[PDB]
Amino acid sequence: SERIVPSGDVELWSDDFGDPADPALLLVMGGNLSALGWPDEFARRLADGGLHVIRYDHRDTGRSTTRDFAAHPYGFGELAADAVAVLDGWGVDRAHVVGLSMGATITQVIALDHHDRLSSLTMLLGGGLDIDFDANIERVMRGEPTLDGLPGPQQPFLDALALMNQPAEGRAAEVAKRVSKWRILSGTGVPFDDAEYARWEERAIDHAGGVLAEPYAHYSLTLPPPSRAAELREVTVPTLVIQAEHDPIAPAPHGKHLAGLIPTARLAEIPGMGHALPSSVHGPLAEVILAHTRSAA
Ligand SMILES: CC[C@]1(O)Cc2cc3c(c(O)c2[C@@H](O[C@H]2C[C@H](N(C)C)[C@H](O[C@@H]4C[C@H](O)[C@@H](O[C@H]5CCC(=O)[C@@H](C)O5)[C@H](C)O4)[C@H](C)O2)C1)C(=O)c1c(O)cccc1C3=O
């Protein structure tokens, strides 16, 4: 089912998968990605292990309140409170939360400031609050090292940004463009299927009322200060960090580093995976997340 949930001065679109009596699993997408960034088929694979899976559209994506950022600015504090508002909207006290990419940054903020709402934490395709990500994009482009000493974003990420700057006319061209972006980001380490990703994007576009433009408000976000990383030493819910082996945005050992900030963190690595969700990795991802959520309950 779906519902619109209130969160301060925004309304958030949300839907679910599985039995509402099973333990709650909240999926938190990356930057500028609506609910439909989590493929329906992945959400079902997870739900069919014994979970009530809930996903939603961040503000400025999908069917959630969309606004001129400059007139009404927000940060990760708001994004995290919004995730908790979705839990409120579905009557959920504590949830297994899963943060992907920019969403892993959000879930670190949840863990720090809404820790009481967590059964467990899972993060993937992401990195620690002490990683100055935006500054690091700037540094890699100028050939400077990162101040954290871990790998910055790699060539496929940059290639993906250059594609996004190229023009697409009409729905067919937009979908093709988006799929080419994902193909770049996913790499060749695991089987990538263009037809499936095209369908996922067609659904994402339909969900946005057929509008072809990607969300863009999240490019105006400012990251939490790196001082917040130190506070993760006080997190006590079971934490799982998943490293995609060939992640071009957050390469190894970002995952190991993120796990090293949280005393309850364990690290897993999906062989061959890039920064995308082809159905080739839905089985492996669901398996490790399910095993984690079971041990926390
Ligand atoms: C495009 C794919 C993507 O990068 C996937 C991803 C991955 C990570 C993070 C993201 O925010 C995001 C998401 O990132 C978004 C938002 C992100 N932030 C504002 C934080 C960033 O957008 C940027 C950073 C640039 O430095 C900035 O560039 C210039 C443009 C001209 C200007 O306005 C000046 C001030 O800034 C633009 C406006 O914003 C990237 C390019 O897209 C999407 C992270 O935030 C992140 C992290 O914080 C720590 C560890 C790892 C990560 C990530 O792996």
UniProtKB/Swiss-Prot annotation:
Q: How does activity depend on pH?
A: Optimum pH is 7.5.
Any one GO biological process: antibiotic biosynthetic process
Q: Give the residues annotated as active site.
A: S101, D247, H275
Q: Does the keyword Lipoprotein apply?
A: no
Identify the InterPro entries for this entry: AB_hydrolase, AB_hydrolase_1, AB_hydrolase_fold
Subunit structure of this entry? Monomer.
Instruction: Report the family membership.
Output: Belongs to the AB hydrolase superfamily. Hydrolase RdmC family.
Q: What is this protein called?
A: Aclacinomycin methylesterase RdmC
Organism the protein comes from: Streptomyces purpurascens
Organism lineage string? Bacteria, Bacillati, Actinomycetota, Actinomycetes, Kitasatosporales
